[PDB]
Design a protein around this ligand. Structure first.
Ligand SMILES: Cc1cn([C@H]2C[C@H](O)[C@@H](CO)O2)c(=O)[nH]c1=O
Ligand SMILES: Cc1cn([C@H]2C[C@H](O)[C@@H](CO)O2)c(=O)[nH]c1=O
Ligand SMILES: Cc1cn([C@H]2C[C@H](O)[C@@H](CO)O2)c(=O)[nH]c1=O
Ligand SMILES: Cc1cn([C@H]2C[C@H](O)[C@@H](CO)O2)c(=O)[nH]c1=O
Ligand SMILES: Cc1cn([C@H]2C[C@H](O)[C@@H](CO)O2)c(=O)[nH]c1=O
Ligand SMILES: Cc1cn([C@H]2C[C@H](O)[C@@H](CO)O2)c(=O)[nH]c1=O
Ligand SMILES: Cc1cn([C@H]2C[C@H](O)[C@@H](CO)O2)c(=O)[nH]c1=O
Ligand SMILES: Cc1cn([C@H]2C[C@H](O)[C@@H](CO)O2)c(=O)[nH]c1=O
Ligand SMILES: O=P(O)(O)O[C@H]1O[C@H](CO)[C@@H](O)[C@H](O)[C@H]1O
Ligand SMILES: O=P(O)(O)O[C@H]1O[C@H](CO)[C@@H](O)[C@H](O)[C@H]1O
Ligand SMILES: O=P(O)(O)O[C@H]1O[C@H](CO)[C@@H](O)[C@H](O)[C@H]1O
Ligand SMILES: O=P(O)(O)O[C@H]1O[C@H](CO)[C@@H](O)[C@H](O)[C@H]1O
Lengths: 292, 292, 292, 292
């Protein structure tokens, strides 16, 4: 078993004033709330016990949206981050939830998509030691954690938002950890940025030779909804795929069902209330259509 | 003086599950909350005393977002609609707010844009008799109120969502009324749809020869965000204009400044808490730029 | 009697490799060739006699697409620009075509759209002395002819691509001239960047107190297809309008019919060969539907 | 040894009037001509010897855009298809080019993208007996060749544009064939639509138990640029990927270099004439960056 966390707080300042009305993680990416996407990432990694961390004001809305997750065969729990003082705080806030288990953290505004993503998640999730992170070639690596490799392809340094990146490979917002993470987070001090950085967590594993950095190839989409423009692009991306395929990206209900965490009758039940719109009609179609 | 009403309730069924998260009128259109758009419409019609109607769960969140309106030189009030039992219910809920004044109703998910919109609005709003509605050529008139004209261009019938529309002219979700509307709404009975219909209101006016139907030409954009696809498209439309012009559509702060409802000093104050993003930067820039 | 010129040449080094295949003005913007847009602008300005300038290689193409114009009630003529040595060259190449008449120049990659644009063009067209241009607020004025206004809104200076723009107002690619333009253009010497600049022609009028600069308001859309991104956005812009309205933008046959330049009968013959697709069906519908 | 064919002709039919001036396969998909996309698919499949088939009027245009291929390490040949009389005509027109070799056909308006596409292609290319095709779940299967599967996942029938489709799986425009294909195509009679159908070619192999139908999973994008709306969607799709990643899709120069069909000296010589725009800057960057 691994336990997962979604970090779905922050201010969403870049998204002002849209986010005055509410969390960037409840606004829609095309047809469904942003949070569905990372939730689904965790689900596809075989994780069913998940803690959602948000701001004090938006926590209740997540709870209304998602509940305890039992309807979807999950065990969802909630905690508050008082202030967005770093990714690594997820491990302090979530210490008791983690207990002595393997864990995973996904950022609330990250969206992933691509052929065999299930396998890429499984590989990381099934490991039982160290840390795993994913490196993705981006245009503006300065906005992210940046991994440098040597000539042989081995990662040699990490830097958080460097003005002068040492490569174009960003560390994405998905991280898998062994039982060493909590203790590492606890010994962290705030960065000059004023945050407890996930990059310092990861450097600590790197230093001990225990960070696995796996390339996420160009054939995958890793997007993030942090800007007005990026959020619209993500929306359009999802739209184009779903209207082409007649299939939906990141339907928790679908994923649950395919993973056998809920059964046909349960799914039919989930569909009923949503039946007056296309999402409901889609859940129903899933009962009598085989999709490879 | 004319008083305004924003109907910002409904279930937003077509946007499920995105709207299980929050009211459709709190979702963004590109860069700002949907409600900014109809609010701006009323503002551009010279209306500053506005009633916002929403559901029992969301009415307070709109209150949370916009407060009493004084920071923007407006007088905003709030009322709850217990069930989305029809647009015409705005006049019963809003009966005491209206008093013996002229009124205007704008729908929460309607977005307008175009050259001389201010003039178009002013003309309807400055009339002191009958009713005024706007007729816009659409692809799928079956989804709206439809107005049929004689050979002479005079409006001769209205039908709500006809299976066989008599024309391609839709009645947009903006309505201006004299003192007769409250009594007309109070006598309406539910339609076969189970709704108290604005179309029936407008018909009563038409029957007494007191309905002005003005054409809103093809040069204007009238959009509604009722479906996932249309919400996205409105987002892209707005983004294209804004990214081209370096001007923003339906920024209430800007419009209030321009109508002299607030002065330079007030605007500098509104910009301050927003200064860390592009939207606050833009309000600041307006203090030192003449825009024609 | 005013004659039109469409300047549709230009290096394709930029949008290479897209434009290695097809010159820019032959590429579509959503559903019809780019040149339809500026062609429609001239038509909406009441101009029937039009000269299309392209590269030597592209003139046959333009001719194949458009012909002599007679089927749309136009008089189209063609000329070549060997080298893209400046917009003002259009008046040297077009000297014989213009003769002793008033003229208008439109850029081949410029798309305009908005309420009462007809009336806007008319105001410039009716002026018989001097020149008329339009000013549009843009995000990146450094990329255009920039017009500076004094505190009372009078145009006081023009600079082509200033490093330090004096305003955010661009002079758009739509220019109206009296009889003086050809001699002005003859006297011009190339600018530092080596082009015979339209900005210089406009300044010659300005220095004589004969330049009328009109504001093209923010309710108008003025787009150019100069970048991959900007072409894309212009495509989505037209698509949203067209799909919303069930009406099409810059359809020359429609414009010609509305202007009485061709009759019902002529339009039905234009429609027949296009009848298997949407565009021909749209033209047919125009025959049986009144559009205000 | 497998040879390739791109079929890049076609009525033009619809996209009128966008395609009066030129063929659909020369239109840009965001930043490069559409033909680059299927061209790159064959390249990614390890195919260097390719035949491009088009119309009398367009074949030349393709030749001018791409030449003989030698600068990209390719051997490109051209042939004309007099009338768009069916996809299986490619095997007639292409008979001498193919000789006794294995072959692959791709449709000129098909765009594929996804993680491990190269491995997907390889799998099919390495099967030297019979045929291989791909099945992709779509919303409107009635537009395509449709493939039906039994309860156990085996392909059991094909139907071209069926009125009542038996599944939602379309056969994509990418086909691998052994030596039997030419004769199979030779023996075909046109269908009740008037075409020599690839679906009949495919059926022929199926009826011999020699058709391999592989699932192309939902993690892949398979788009058809055959409508106005679909071309725009594909453009946005590419743009979103390229702008997020700083890597281009279907850049033949890159693919050639990565396959070692050209060396760095060659790649630099290709970058030179494009150096004044982003495209050439990208090529140059590829000489000094490792991309995984
Ligand atoms: C810095 C920080 C970000 N976030 C959220 C916002 C986004 O979903 C994501 C990336 O910033 O993390 C938090 O929830 N807490 C924090 O301390
Ligand atoms: C099976 C399945 C996959 N996916 C996603 C995971 C991948 O990014 C992609 C390919 O499996 O689709 C869903 O979003 N829902 C699903 O039910
Ligand atoms: C029918 C109905 C709609 N609405 C809102 C939803 C949209 O913004 C719009 C049109 O359905 O009005 C209400 O607020 N109350 C209602 O009773
Ligand atoms: C003046 C002004 C106009 N607008 C809108 C009103 C019209 O639809 C268009 C042209 O004035 O722009 C704004 O959104 N904000 C403004 O400050
Ligand atoms: C500079 C120049 C541009 N152009 C065209 C390309 C575009 O449509 C536009 C603006 O750069 O004018 C010419 O046709 N000739 C020229 O000499
Ligand atoms: C009347 C008409 C206008 N237009 C454009 C001109 C303007 O930008 C807008 C408003 O009339 O629509 C067309 O494209 N075609 C037409 O037939
Ligand atoms: C039917 C047909 C299609 N095509 C092309 C047009 C498109 O790219 C594709 C599928 O319609 O094949 C031909 O080149 N020749 C043909 O005979
Ligand atoms: C290696 C490489 C892949 N691709 C495409 C192929 C696949 O669809 C995707 C993943 O390798 O990207 C390119 O377009 N160019 C390339 O250079
Ligand atoms: O989004 P943030 O909190 O500015 O940055 C976070 O985002 C990225 C993922 O989206 C990560 O690579 C960064 O290392 C992390 O700090
Ligand atoms: O959106 P609704 O509740 O189905 O319909 C409402 O909105 C339309 C505008 O959006 C109007 O034409 C209809 O007359 C009105 O009933
Ligand atoms: O596109 P160009 O030749 O760099 O620029 C031209 O186009 C602009 C509008 O499209 C004008 O404002 C410029 O004055 C003119 O030089
Ligand atoms: O586009 P067409 O010629 O109608 O159809 C062709 O294209 C499709 C892919 O684009 C295939 O599934 C069809 O079997 C083929 O006949």
């Amino acid at each position: 078993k691994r336990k997962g966390i979604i970090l779905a707080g922050g201010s969403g300042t870049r998204l002002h004033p849209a986010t005055l009305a509410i969390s960037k993680q409840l606004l829609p990416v095309y047809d469904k709330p942003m949070i569905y996407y990372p939730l689904s990432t965790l689900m596809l990694a075989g994780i069913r016990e998940i803690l959602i961390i948000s701001t004090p004001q938006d926590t209740p809305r997540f709870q209304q949206l998602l509940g305890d997750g039992s309807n979807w065969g999950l065990d969802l729990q909630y905690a508050v981050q008082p202030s967005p003082d770093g990714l690594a705080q997820a491990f302090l806030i979530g210490e008791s939830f983690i207990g002595n288990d393997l864990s995973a953290l996904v950022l609330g505004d990250n969206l992933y998509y691509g052929h065999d993503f299930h396998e890429l998640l499984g590989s990381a999730s099934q490991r039982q030691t160290g840390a795993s992170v994913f490196a993705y070639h981006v245009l503006d690596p300065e906005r992210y954690g940046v991994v440098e490799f040597d000539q042989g392809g081995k990662a040699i340094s990490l830097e958080e938002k460097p003005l002068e990146p040492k490569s174009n490979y960003a560390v994405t917002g998905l991280y898998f950890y062994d039982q060493q993470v909590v203790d590492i987070a606890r010994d962290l001090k705030p960065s000059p940025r004023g945050e407890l950085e996930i990059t310092d967590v990861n450097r600590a594993y790197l230093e001990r030779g225990q960070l696995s950095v796996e390339i996420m190839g160009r054939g995958y989409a890793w997007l993030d909804t942090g800007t007005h423009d990026s959020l619209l692009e993500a929306g359009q991306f999802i739209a184009t795929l779903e209207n082409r395929q007649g299939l939906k990206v990141a339907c928790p209900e679908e994923i649950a069902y395919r993973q056998k965490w809920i059964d046909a009758a349960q799914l039919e039940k989930l569909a009923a209330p949503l039946a007056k719109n296309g999402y409901g009609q889609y859940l129903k179609r899933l009962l009598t259509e085989t999709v490879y």
